[PDB]
């Protein structure tokens, strides 16, 4: 007995209370050897690249991606995503855009997007857009990164607190490790969830289940 065909979040949208994740450092830097740089395939490159090893984590954002659209808040059409990349690249998410589970196809996809600058359908499902985040954001909305360093909520008690036209855009690090700074130019409020530190899909998990209770999804 709910609507089976919700409206599709976009930026476009300044009104609709929603939630917002923005998945920040994300990983994801294409290379001609075209695949996406990471730390199980790509060991002797990234070492003669000079780079840390372990900083190269797409499985990362493309985990946090499937958690993310597979949830009932997605569906329910309360849910936007949004991508960070280390090197400063700005990913609009369509709602209804279908992730690859496999790494190989997500990889492929990450770089078509990223040469491209879109993925068609003649509709957008994923758009590099400009640079502020806070363009693209609801006018009224909250903005909380999750820290494993802050005091920790309850995700329901947080969420039931915001005005009826209050939306919510929580920052994750898209990464394993990792200083909790990457969005103190759009925060002004630092939140725990725990107290053990949570893979980044875990923290997406649960911040949807939180906000599902509380939106009676």
Known sequence: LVPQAPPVLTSKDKITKRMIVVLAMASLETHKIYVLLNCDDHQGLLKKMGRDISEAR?????????????????KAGKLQVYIQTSRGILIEVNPTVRIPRTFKRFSGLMVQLLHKLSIRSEEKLLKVIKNPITDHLPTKC????????????????????????????????AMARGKDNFADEYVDEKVGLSNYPLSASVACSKFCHGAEDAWNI
């Open 58 to 74: 797409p499985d990362i954002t493309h985990q946090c991606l499937l958690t993310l659209l597979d949830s009932p808040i997605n």
């Open 142 to 173: 909250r903005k909380v990164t999750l820290s494993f360093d802050a005091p920790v909520i309850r995700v329901q008690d947080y969420i039931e607190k915001l005005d009826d036209d209050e939306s919510i855009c929580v920052f994750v690090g």
